[PDB]
Design a protein around this ligand. Structure first.
Ligand code: EST
Ligand code: EST
Ligand code: EST
Ligand code: EST
Ligand code: EST
Ligand code: NAG
Ligand code: NAG
Ligand code: NAG
Ligand code: NAG
Ligand code: NAG
Ligand code: NAG
Ligand code: NAG
Ligand code: NAG
Ligand code: NAG
Ligand code: NAG
Ligand code: OCT
Ligand code: OCT
Ligand code: OCT
Ligand code: OCT
Ligand code: OCT
Ligand code: OCT
Ligand code: OCT
Ligand code: OCT
Ligand code: OCT
Ligand code: OCT
Ligand code: OCT
Ligand code: OCT
Ligand code: OCT
Ligand code: OCT
Ligand code: OCT
Ligand code: OCT
Ligand code: OCT
Ligand code: OCT
Ligand code: OCT
Ligand code: OCT
Ligand code: HEX
Ligand code: HEX
Ligand code: HEX
Ligand code: HEX
Ligand code: HEX
Ligand code: CL
Lengths: 322, 322, 322, 322, 322
């Protein structure tokens, strides 16, 4: 009866796992998941499968036999969707030795969940993993382990992403508990992800800084030139609003406050202050003309105070986000 | 004949349900639905399945047997789409005791409907549920209940969404009626959803307020400076229109009026009034020059009246939406 | 032989239909279709299915039997895609009476075609329908009718759409002809759709009107102030172009002219005329200065003529679209 | 053995085709394909299917028999994807006469490839076709023809697209060759497509023309008014750039130069020239003041030259694209 | 036993491959893959299939037999997804000779991975390939080769893409190694891709250049005209920011720095310098007036220095990217 495991009713069957990674295929920051494609290999012994031959060598069989015999039942924990490839036929392999020792192999694609934190964006670093477990049988019936310890993961040479840098592949194990069903063995594959920071600098931090620097030119123009100092400020506000809106229309739509938001809105406030300043100056000059009938003090103080405050802001900000 | 239920033609079979939630996977505000992934477990007794063994312990069987025996037929009410996972094999488990007591378990993903009301956006709160029912058999043939009352729902530790905060998981029951078919028992899982309000404040309410404050600077500039007071107002109109359009291009495209729309358009009207004001002043000054051949009264009244009206608006608005 | 209908070779079999609507799920204006989810029920008599029991009561059977017996073959006319739900098992029910009277029931989702006309957008009203027909058998073999006349449609209480208002559900029948195959009976479900008009007013008609009103302020400023009257007009053109582009980027991309387009472009022409007007005035004043070496007539006529023409435009436009 | 065709090893079997079109469903300009839904009908004679009855009339059978008998094997040449509808059961019909004459019918949806050329956009016209061929058997085994010549295509009354106008349905035939396999018979359905040109005119050509006309107003303003003639030109450049960007953000993303691109960029150059012109005038006036210590010649020539060149441009352009 | 290959336990079976390409269907630059549709053909000899006939000619069989006999098991290396077409029936062909020589043919669509480098965008050139391999059997059991050397690839006449130009189709072979399973033979199809460069020039490089040229007009306007020289520069900054944002909103979202980015941001810096320049001039003139109570030197130097630097920039840039 191949509807029962080897040693059914006695001790547990040892089963050993080996993996080779083909590609990482895509990543979603909104949905917090990744997609991966791999080969997965299993090893065990089943004397019911032993056959009388002198060759001492394995024999390859088609995947038709897999529906007749007994076979493990691993599954991918915290997956959203997966499948086995089937063109031009099922991507399945079975090899059996005269002893009854079996090798069993599959090609599969999996989408898996990875919780991410974007509060340090674009200076964040993320770490994800893929988890493998037996569905039906508990550690009292099936023993699951990496077939060669640390050497049981292989990774392909041409793996890459158009938006990320990948590093630090390693494996580990853990024992897990369900309240209604029991204890199981679980295997893990781990890796790390990072970004290209200079791209984001050039695209986001650089224009805003130039705009704040442009708002400081106003302190050096003659206060008598009202039709020249009034349009400059409000046009500068317009430009900065355009820039911020542009950045908002292309972000990955996660709805909480991130490191880059703070920089942008602080720059906005600096430009806004620059526009209240000249109103101060104009009003005071005008009342002086009225009262009676050279650079203003607030101009020559602003020329020092504004840049120094911006420099202090930058020091603190990059002390916090490093 | 496993084409008939236990006790077929006599009283009803009691069946008990247990659930554990793996993840919430996505949410659509336009389509008004959510996606969830879970384990679902069933319990019943069927003496046709009893077997002679002394062990007093359950035996695990593969999912091949499920197509041979009789099994419940639960389904998800108000679902749009669902499926059972099948890699590397069907995610199905069957455990049977010498008595004929059965345990039956599945892993599934479901998309379900949840009517939402966005009229208090972004200050809304939504509540959704998942509903479970038997398709074919009525309460005269099958009795459906939670296996352990309030303790029959478990929820995973690492559940989260990139756009929402989740709280308040609990279960309940109700009896339901179809006019052409009869009465059935129904089980429910309920939960609540909320947003991050400070994000939306900073992104939407803050720029508009700054713009209205910028429009009030005009009352303090000398009415004699026409080429300075005329471009300021119309450029301010341009900036506010840009801001409103930016917000309109990223909203979730539900076509009725919401709490935030009102704020934005009232700010627009304030900026517009500021531009009619100086036209009043300019015209009256000009006719006075003509008639004959110091701050104007309408300027020094506007400096008080405009901010006070905006303050009244804010008081009422936040008394209504709280 | 259940490969032949009841009364095969004699008169036609009467089959009666009953329907209950669960939800409308989505709508596409670009593709001109909608998606709906429903229960569908069939009734007929087949003496081959009669069984000797005294109970005078129906017996419920699983969906395994449906592949053995004979069953109708209805299909959805003018559908793009459909399917039957299958979790946790096929959503199929079979009930049979000792007489051989049968009841047969399904749960399904359908996407169906509905030709729409958007030329009165956003003041349009649309009407769609779902059509049911037998595929293989003609009115000489199968007779199809609503089981209870007008009472054979039920609709759920919690149906709604985030973009539309639904009204006027009713059913009817018609006889249809194919040239190569024959005559068939067809059943219909009809309903109507409408929009929220105030949303569209506030978002589209209101800003444009305010802009046209802003362009009329120019007639009251002193013609001597050239650097004040020249930038006002061209900035107003810029603002109106921004607004029109914003509306164009969010419409449902159907490529013919609609009711709202006309309003927007007529407003554009009014703003454009306002800018040619002052050029007239400036040139004539300048040649008068040259010739020789108070409000201009064209100013004080424009102050009357422009608003009156806009009022006439609005009267005609809302007489046409009502 | 229904694993062999009628007359297997002798001459070829004649098979006749009939088609009725239900809808065209969608079109992709980026991917260069369309989607269509139709009924497809086949006719042939097979004496193995003959049965002893006096009725002289056809008998309708369910689609279960189709997997037992022999049946043609047509397929859709240059398709990307297709399928047969299956709700509430397979959309298949089989009718057989006592003679062994058979009729066989299917309902299907197909996506097919159509190479398009957009270089005359939006003044282009496209022509597409659907191709039908036998997969396995060559013209030495199977003869394929339209069952009634030109009368073998029917088209539904309510066919339409939200973006296109459809005309000119007709059928034809051709003989085709594969180098490794042989000669086959092929059938074709052809049709033509066109656009709504006034929509595109109003949305694209009209604003740009108005902007060029606005740039010519500058030649009539007094050269002494520098703060009035300088901002006008650069604001006009800004407006035209906004318009061009708006059009670029909604086009179907095919990356080569089209008829409308040329118009837009030529208008851009005209506006740019207008801004160099006044610089000429200002500089020359200023050096004259310096040298010494009425309308300028370049103004009164520009007033003639610019519009005439634009008129020449339009004549040539519409002589080329008609 | 057709569960074993020809010559099972002896030497390896030679199998020969032939291919014809129907279309390339789509390309993703973000995901770095392409989609292709083809016919694939196999040749081998199996004496178990030999039959006694004098004809010396092949016999065509339906695809029902393929599930009974033994057949190769090729698969597509570095594919993301694939499938075999099945309407109106499986696109499969089997031809067998009295000898036992077999021909076997399929129609399929494949999506395959191709690593791309965009750092020279839009002046890049990409090269991709499709790889074919046997899944289960190693070079000790199956020998895989092109059936006619270089002549075993055919390509269709009407292949094209709306965004790319295709050239240089050829085939090759390589021997490959897996650490846990052995050595295999692999076949390759290679091709090259290129863009339309003039489109990208006109859309991106041309406007920016015109804007830089517009910023140089300021050096020729009279330094006394402050309300004319101040708004020109800041409006020019606004226009250039709009242009850059427009380009950023339509690029294929790969997050590293490319050839075109550099040009755009260098143009931005040139426009920014032009605005600091006049501030220099204004301040120095003003202090001279104060000190005491003709073209400035910095103006007449800028008129030479700015264009020469831009010309040097262009020379170096196009020496690097050619
Ligand atoms: C930097 C921008 C915002 C962030 C965008 C982003 C954000 C996240 C990510 O994974 C990729 C990209 C690519 C395009 C980027 C944008 C291009 C212009 C925009 O300002
Ligand atoms: C706040 C904005 C409008 C509302 C948008 C929204 C709205 C609903 C939602 O669930 C998420 C988001 C994320 C992006 C938000 C946008 C970013 C900028 C824009 O103004
Ligand atoms: C009203 C707008 C154009 C029409 C848009 C539309 C159009 C049709 C529709 O069914 C829904 C919506 C929602 C978003 C709307 C847009 C929001 C801003 C824009 O101006
Ligand atoms: C005309 C526009 C560009 C071309 C766009 C297009 C282009 C091709 C097409 O098949 C449909 C449409 C609809 C929306 C159109 C746009 C609306 C505004 C924009 O300017
Ligand atoms: C050239 C633009 C940026 C690059 C865009 C692109 C980029 C890559 C690509 O494969 C196609 C296209 C088509 C549309 C292009 C855009 C149209 C306007 C925009 O400036
Ligand atoms: C079982 C075992 O050997 N595990 C090791 C792990 O401890 C180590 O961290 C990793 C490389 O760092 O290699 C592996
Ligand atoms: C059957 C039962 O015990 N139901 C309770 C419910 O009444 C209570 O509200 C909830 C926690 O609030 O816990 C559960
Ligand atoms: C067969 C029949 O009774 N049909 C009626 C129909 O005539 C009527 O219009 C509708 C309600 O208006 O109710 C139903
Ligand atoms: C075989 C045959 O009759 N073909 C004709 C074709 O020649 C003609 O062009 C078309 C209508 O124009 O009608 C059909
Ligand atoms: C096996 C063989 O003949 N291969 C050749 C290859 O060397 C050559 O490069 C190509 C055309 O360039 O044609 C093929
Ligand atoms: C393999 O089989 C041969 C007999 O053919 C035997 O001599 C040898 O010892 C075997 N080796 C192993 C490792 O079992
Ligand atoms: C379990 O079975 C044993 C016999 O093996 C018996 O002694 C014991 O009472 C049983 N326990 C229960 C709870 O049925
Ligand atoms: C139902 O069956 C009972 C016998 O059990 C009979 O007396 C009664 O008349 C039947 N009713 C109908 C409506 O057939
Ligand atoms: C049809 O069959 C009848 C016999 O029932 C015969 O008289 C008649 O000629 C037949 N007609 C044709 C067209 O075969
Ligand atoms: C083909 O078969 C004929 C016998 O029918 C034989 O005479 C001829 O030589 C054969 N040709 C080949 C190439 O095998
Ligand atoms: C490679 C350009 C980096 C620019 C950094 C600017 C930080 C304000
Ligand atoms: C979490 C602190 C946010 C501060 C935002 C300040 C914007 C001016
Ligand atoms: C809105 C600016 C007002 C400035 C007033 C300054 C009074 C000292
Ligand atoms: C932020 C600058 C303040 C300057 C104050 C000057 C008071 C004389
Ligand atoms: C964290 C910033 C909150 C800003 C609130 C502004 C409300 C007008
Ligand atoms: C439902 C009341 C809407 C009021 C909108 C007012 C816009 C100025
Ligand atoms: C459009 C503004 C007109 C202002 C007229 C004021 C007359 C008292
Ligand atoms: C909204 C301000 C009105 C001011 C009126 C002043 C009349 C003298
Ligand atoms: C609820 C606001 C309606 C605004 C209508 C404006 C029509 C021009
Ligand atoms: C079908 C008439 C369209 C008229 C458009 C007028 C635009 C100014
Ligand atoms: C482009 C405006 C020209 C105005 C000329 C008016 C001549 C009476
Ligand atoms: C549209 C206003 C025309 C005014 C003409 C005035 C002629 C003296
Ligand atoms: C229906 C409006 C057509 C406008 C054509 C404009 C051509 C420059
Ligand atoms: C193929 C000729 C393109 C010409 C473009 C001219 C743009 C000013
Ligand atoms: C950039 C404009 C320069 C104009 C110089 C004209 C010399 C005749
Ligand atoms: C394009 C207009 C050129 C005008 C030249 C005038 C030379 C006196
Ligand atoms: C076909 C127009 C090419 C324009 C090239 C511009 C390069 C700066
Ligand atoms: C990799 C060098 C980037 C240089 C960017 C310079 C932007 C001004
Ligand atoms: C921000 C511009 C300052 C210019 C100062 C020049 C001093 C020689
Ligand atoms: C980049 C132009 C610098 C000009 C310096 C002139 C010093 C007299
Ligand atoms: C925002 C600056 C105000 C200065 C008041 C003296
Ligand atoms: C909108 C303000 C008008 C004031 C008239 C005195
Ligand atoms: C567009 C208004 C022109 C007036 C000419 C007198
Ligand atoms: C672009 C116009 C230049 C005219 C020089 C006289
Ligand atoms: C950016 C130009 C500065 C010139 C200082 C003399
Ligand atoms: Cl925009």
């Amino acid at each position: 009866d191949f509807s029962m495991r080897p040693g059914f009713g006695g001790p547990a069957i040892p089963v050993g796992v080996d993996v080779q990674v083909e590609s990482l295929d895509s990543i979603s920051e909104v949905d917090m998941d990744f997609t991966m494609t791999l080969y997965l290999r299993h090893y065990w012994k089943d004397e019911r499968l032993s056959f009388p031959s002198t060759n001492n060598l394995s024999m390859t069989f088609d995947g038709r036999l897999v529906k007749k015999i007994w076979v493990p039942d691993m599954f991918f924990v915290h997956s959203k969707r997966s499948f086995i490839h089937d063109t031009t036929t099922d991507n399945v392999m079975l090899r059996v030795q005269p002893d009854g020792k079996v090798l069993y192999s599959l090609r599969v694609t999996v989408t898996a969940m990875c919780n991410m934190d974007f509060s340090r964006f674009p200076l964040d670093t993320q770490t994800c993993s893929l988890e493998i477990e037996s569905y039906a049988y508990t550690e009292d019936d099936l023993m699951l382990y990496w077939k060669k310890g640390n050497d049981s993961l292989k990774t392909d040479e041409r793996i890459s992403l158009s938006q990320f840098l990948i590093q630090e592949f390693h494996t580990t194990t853990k024992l897990a508990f369900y309240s209604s069903t029991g204890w199981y063995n679980r295997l893990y594959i781990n890796f790390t992800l990072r970004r290209h920071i200079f791209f984001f600098l050039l695209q986001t931090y650089f224009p805003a800084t130039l705009m704040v620097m442009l708002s400081w030119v106003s302190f050096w123009i003659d206060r008598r030139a009202v039709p020249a100092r009034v349009p400059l400020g409000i046009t500068t506000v317009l430009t900065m609003s355009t820039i911020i809106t542009g950045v908002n229309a292309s972000m990955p739509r996660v709805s909480y406050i991130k490191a880059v938001d703070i920089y942008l809105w602080v720059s906005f406030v600096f430009v806004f202050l620059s526009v209240l300043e000249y109103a101060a100056v104009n009003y005071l000059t005008t009342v002086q003309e009225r009262k009676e009938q050279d650079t203003h003090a607030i101009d020559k103080y602003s020329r020092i105070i504004f840049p120094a405050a911006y420099i202090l802001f930058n020091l603190i900000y990059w002390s916090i986000f490093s």
